[PDB]
Design an enzyme around this catalytic site. Structure first.
Site, PDB file in Angstrom:
ATOM      1  N   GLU A  73      38.425  45.236  48.205  1.00 34.67           N
ATOM      2  CA  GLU A  73      38.975  44.650  46.774  1.00 34.67           C
ATOM      3  C   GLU A  73      37.785  44.485  46.126  1.00 34.67           C
ATOM      4  OE1 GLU A  73      41.682  43.829  45.743  1.00 34.67           O
ATOM      5  OE2 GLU A  73      42.965  43.538  47.273  1.00 34.67           O
TER       6      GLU A  73
ATOM      7  N   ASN B 299      43.721  44.093  34.320  1.00 36.47           N
ATOM      8  CA  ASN B 299      44.698  45.102  34.223  1.00 36.47           C
ATOM      9  C   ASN B 299      45.505  45.163  33.190  1.00 36.47           C
ATOM     10  OD1 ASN B 299      44.745  44.992  37.380  1.00 36.47           O
ATOM     11  ND2 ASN B 299      44.973  42.861  36.858  1.00 36.47           N
TER      12      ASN B 299
ATOM     13  N   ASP C  18      49.702  44.314  32.450  1.00 34.44           N
ATOM     14  CA  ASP C  18      50.085  43.130  32.268  1.00 34.44           C
ATOM     15  C   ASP C  18      49.280  42.102  31.739  1.00 34.44           C
ATOM     16  OD1 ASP C  18      48.877  42.385  34.638  1.00 34.44           O
ATOM     17  OD2 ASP C  18      50.331  41.301  35.493  1.00 34.44           O
TER      18      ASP C  18
ATOM     19  N   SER D 181      46.614  40.522  33.124  1.00 33.55           N
ATOM     20  CA  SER D 181      45.934  39.646  34.000  1.00 33.55           C
ATOM     21  C   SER D 181      44.472  40.115  34.383  1.00 33.55           C
ATOM     22  CB  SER D 181      46.746  39.570  35.325  1.00 33.55           C
ATOM     23  OG  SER D 181      46.907  40.642  36.084  1.00 33.55           O
TER      24      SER D 181
ATOM     25  N   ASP E 234      41.798  40.371  37.936  1.00 33.25           N
ATOM     26  CA  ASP E 234      41.368  39.923  39.301  1.00 33.25           C
ATOM     27  C   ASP E 234      40.063  39.406  39.231  1.00 33.25           C
ATOM     28  OD1 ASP E 234      43.994  41.118  40.018  1.00 33.25           O
ATOM     29  OD2 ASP E 234      43.187  43.070  39.885  1.00 33.25           O
TER      30      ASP E 234
ATOM     31  N   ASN F  57      44.314  37.323  41.576  1.00 29.79           N
ATOM     32  CA  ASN F  57      45.045  37.285  40.379  1.00 29.79           C
ATOM     33  C   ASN F  57      45.311  35.999  39.455  1.00 29.79           C
ATOM     34  OD1 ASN F  57      47.833  38.118  38.667  1.00 29.79           O
ATOM     35  ND2 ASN F  57      46.461  39.927  38.718  1.00 29.79           N
TER      36      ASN F  57
END
Length: 130
Positions: free
Chosen positions: A35, A46, A49, A51, A53, A60
């Site tokens: 990750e 992202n 959408d 959002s 991380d 998220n």
């Protein structure tokens, strides 16, 4: 902060991650590795959408933490996403425990399915004394 492998392994064990909800320490290490590369300040937007991380586990903003700019988002860990960018990983760990408590468990992270599931994950903790 960029953790060294074993340093992180020992930290996670102390924070009670080994076997949390059936998830072994080596799985959490595999997850952290893919990750963020063990980097606590890693962020990923992202575009699709809206959002983001956050942190070592790339948690998220849509369901787990609040950053205020993510549309129709919730804050299950009840934390500012800023808390997931600290060098001290206590809050990031408490939030990861919350994610694992969900029906999907460790499967909530697609990266885990791609890079860790059904693989020999021993290498992530070998030689670390945990």
């Amino acid at each position: 902060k960029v953790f060294e492998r074993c340093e992180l392994a020992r930290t996670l064990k102390r924070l009670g991650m080994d076997g949390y909800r059936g998830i072994s320490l080596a799985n959490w290490m595999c997850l952290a590795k893919w990750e963020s590369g063990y980097n606590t300040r890693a962020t990923n937007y992202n575009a699709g959408d809206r959002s983001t991380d956050y942190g070592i586990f790339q948690i998220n903003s849509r369901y787990w933490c609040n950053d205020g700019k993510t549309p129709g988002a919730v804050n299950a860990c009840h934390l500012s996403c800023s808390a997931l960018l600290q060098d001290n990983i206590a809050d990031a760990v408490a939030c990861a425990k919350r994610v694992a408590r969900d029906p999907q468990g460790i499967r909530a992270w697609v990266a885990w399915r791609n890079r860790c599931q059904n693989r020999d994950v021993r290498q992530y903790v070998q030689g670390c004394g945990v």
